[PDB]
Write a new protein. Structure first.
Length: 348
């Protein structure tokens, strides 16, 4: 119903409107509730003593951020109902010689890199020091968004589409012991602890500044755009593994199970499992995404890997990735299932 668009597809006036709505949220005092919630969650351990918390390093990571974004989008809309939360596809940016040159970091959107001369404070765009006040872990105004693109050793680059495919392939939502150690965990892989930092965590440390330190990261509006991407990735995974569901269903830590409340709210994973049902959809879920159907199966095809589709002579397809050249990511118009088909089997 409400459509979350890729930052690349936003109109100038869309971008201006998102920025303005955020500045209003900041002025009204609403925005700072989201910083506080995020910090509170991060220090609420499940159970006390573990390094699992309500929002990170555990199974709730995904449903938690979904609910936070849904909440934030609603606040946005209460200001200007036309506004939805866009998403930052960093895998597209990763394709550039210099991802810093992404239009996302323009003075009309998120503004630029930290200024080394000025101690890495941001001095372009609407969130530059002097237009936007930040707070520390304690709540004490620390005045000034900072960023430092790609500066750290562990995270010089943004994750790639291949990095995302690797993750979209994992069959299990999450696995014991439901934390940063989890293996064959779509959730832990997306969070980015498997050979970390990857994907979600990598983006954090790539941006640097407040974004590089989880308790302060929402001081940067881009945190929302980043997380919209993460949620989008999760939604695709849900469409793909439509047979799979969230785990743990039971007997995980309290706060982590399908039906536990996620501190700091009464929202359960279950409550936010079906995003469509929460009133919003990603743009790649309508019609004519980034291309047209190179569809029509020329011949019957039987799958020869786990990530391939089977199909009959006749099935039309919505092609979704072009990268590999020979095997391209598609979606069946009959079955609505998603996986790989070989190019040479379909003609437009
Ligand atoms: Zn977080
Ligand atoms: Zn995050």
């Amino acid at each position: 119903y409400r459509v979350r668009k890729n930052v690349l597809h936003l109109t100038d006036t869309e971008k201006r409107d998102f920025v303005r709505t955020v500045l209003i949220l900041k002025e009204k005092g609403i925005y700072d509730r989201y910083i506080a919630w995020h910090g509170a969650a991060g220090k609420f351990h499940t159970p006390p003593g573990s390094d699992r918390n309500a929002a990170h390093m555990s199974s709730a990571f995904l449903p938690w951020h979904r609910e936070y974004l849904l909440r934030f989008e609603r606040d946005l809309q209460s200001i200007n109902p036309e506004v939805t939360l866009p998403y930052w596809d960093w895998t597209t940016d990763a394709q550039m010689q210099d991802p810093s040159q992404s239009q996302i970091w323009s003075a009309d959107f998120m503004g630029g890199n930290g200024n080394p001369i000025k101690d890495f404070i941001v001095d372009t765009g609407p969130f530059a020091a002097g237009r936007w006040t930040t707070i520390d872990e304690q709540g004490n105004p620390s005045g000034g968004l900072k960023r430092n693109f790609g500066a750290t050793k562990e995270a010089p680059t943004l994750p790639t589409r291949a990095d995302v495919v690797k993750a979209l392939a994992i069959t299990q939502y999450d696995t014991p012991p439901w934390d940063m150690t989890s293996q064959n965990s779509f959730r832990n892989q997306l969070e980015g602890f498997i050979n970390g930092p990857q994907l979600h965590n990598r983006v954090h440390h790539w941006v640097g500044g407040q974004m590089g330190v989880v308790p302060t990261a929402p001081n940067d509006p881009v945190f929302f755009l980043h997380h919209a991407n993460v949620d989008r990735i999760w939604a695709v995974w849900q469409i793909i593994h439509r047979n799979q569901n969230y785990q743990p269903m039971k007997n995980g830590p309290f706060g982590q199970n399908f039906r536990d409340p996620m501190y700091p709210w009464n929202t359960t994973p279950e409550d936010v499992m079906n995003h469509r049902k929460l009133g919003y959809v990603y743009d790649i879920e309508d019609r004519n995404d980034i291309n047209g159907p190179i569809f029509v199966a020329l011949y019957d095809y039987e799958a020869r890997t786990e990530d391939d589709l089977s199909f009959h002579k006749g099935e039309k397809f919505q092609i979704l990735d072009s990268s590999e050249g020979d095997w391209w990511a598609a979606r069946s118009l009959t079955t609505g299932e998603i996986g790989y088909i070989p190019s040479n089997y379909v003609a437009p």
